[PDB]
Design a binder for this molecule. Structure first.
Ligand SMILES: CCN(C)C(=O)c1ccc2c(c1)NC(=O)/C2=C(\Nc1ccc(CN2CCCCC2)cc1)c1ccccc1
Length: 330
């Protein structure tokens, strides 16, 4: 990397390039070994997220442990060798392995966002009518790009998230959402009908798990079942976004789905009794019937919380309906 080059210039070099893939392997190795670590920003299920600084500019670094090498490679392979660079998808920068053995350092570099995740943003701030649509449209457009498959070698395979939640979705400076953490994700090619992962066990957060996954009725051979499972998880995220929407002071306190039906850190058996056995779904308050924006969101939510997978809406359908709703108020 030559003198005077900035991170903002590097983003343009990979996005407007001939191939929509990431930065070169030698360039990616240089970036990771130049990042000045400032402070630990947060932690999830795999690794620890740290706030770094490359040539003055703020950057996000995910330091993975030597034991969790599977989670590091899966995310790095999905972010690189596919061609997926979208506005509503986390802007990947670099992936590097420093040492060897038990003291192996696994790094994952991406764009930094001051507001943080949707979970931290909603618990701290109250959204407006126009703002609520912007967060929902971006989340719908994000998964629409992931599920979209372009056939002809130069395109991208169909990817299912498998673990969609408010903690996994980050919010940008302009109030736009970007999908993050693709460590548990699954790739699919329609030309040969093959899936990279080993399908046999349940994955992700139990709170956001689909009923088909919970009662083992899900057909793991079918890729559409994984796509439809993400739609149900997106509907639970859509429930909490519209809940914090204030129309003249009237707004509800931020709570996770099934907060009154399930406690913190739930088991497989406990979540099965609410979703599968009793067929209970998150409560939609009466005040939501007042305005158009809150009423349309509630209609999509019930059309995403179906017991049957095939009956649920598609990622492009939620994207198209929200785009028409946004045009009503600009
Ligand atoms: C390519 C793999 N990586 C690095 C990620 O997936 C990843 C993960 C996480 C982040 C990120 C990227 N970029 C960020 O800005 C990230 C995160 N940004 C962030 C930035 C600032 C805060 C502080 N926050 C506290 C609550 C009120 C609002 C401000 C909280 C989170 C982050 C880190 C840990 C858990 C949840 C969110």
């Amino acid at each position: 990397i030559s003198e005077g080059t900035t991170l903002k210039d590097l983003i343009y070099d990979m996005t407007t390039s001939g191939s929509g893939s990431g930065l070169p392997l030698l360039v990616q190795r240089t970036i990771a070994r130049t990042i000045v670590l400032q402070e630990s920003i947060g932690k999830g299920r795999f690794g620890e997220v740290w706030r770094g600084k490359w040539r003055g500019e703020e950057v996000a670094v995910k330091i993975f442990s030597s034991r969790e090498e599977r989670s590091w490679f899966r995310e790095a392979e999905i972010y690189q060798t596919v061609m997926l660079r979208h506005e509503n998808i986390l802007g990947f920068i670099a992936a590097d392995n420093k040492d060897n053995g038990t003291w192996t350092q696994l790094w994952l570099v991406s764009d930094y966002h001051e507001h943080g995740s949707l979970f931290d943003y909603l618990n701290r701030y109250t959204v407006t009518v126009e703002g609520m649509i912007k967060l929902a449209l971006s989340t719908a457009s994000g998964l629409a790009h992931l599920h979209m498959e372009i056939v002809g070698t130069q395109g991208k395979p169909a990817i299912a998230h498998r673990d969609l939640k408010s903690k996994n979705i980050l919010v940008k400076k302009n109030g736009t959402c970007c999908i993050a953490d693709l460590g548990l994700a699954v790739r699919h090619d329609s030309a040969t009908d093959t899936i990279d992962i080993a399908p046999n066990h349940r994955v992700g957060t139990k709170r956001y798990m689909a009923p088909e996954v919970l009662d083992d009725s899900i057909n793991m051979k079918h890729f559409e079942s994984f796509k439809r499972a993400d739609i149900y998880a997106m509907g639970l995220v859509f429930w909490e976004i519209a809940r914090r929407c204030s129309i003249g002071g009237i707004h509800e306190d931020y709570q996770l789905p099934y907060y009154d039906l399930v406690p913190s850190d739930p088991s497989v058996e406990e979540m099965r009794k609410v979703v599968c056995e009793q067929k209970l779904r998150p409560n939609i308050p009466n005040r939501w019937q007042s305005c158009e924006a809150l009423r349309v969101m509630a209609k999509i939510m019930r059309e995403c919380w179906y017991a049957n997978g095939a009956a649920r809406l598609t990622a492009l359908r939620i994207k198209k309906t929200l785009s028409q709703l946004s045009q009503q108020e600009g």
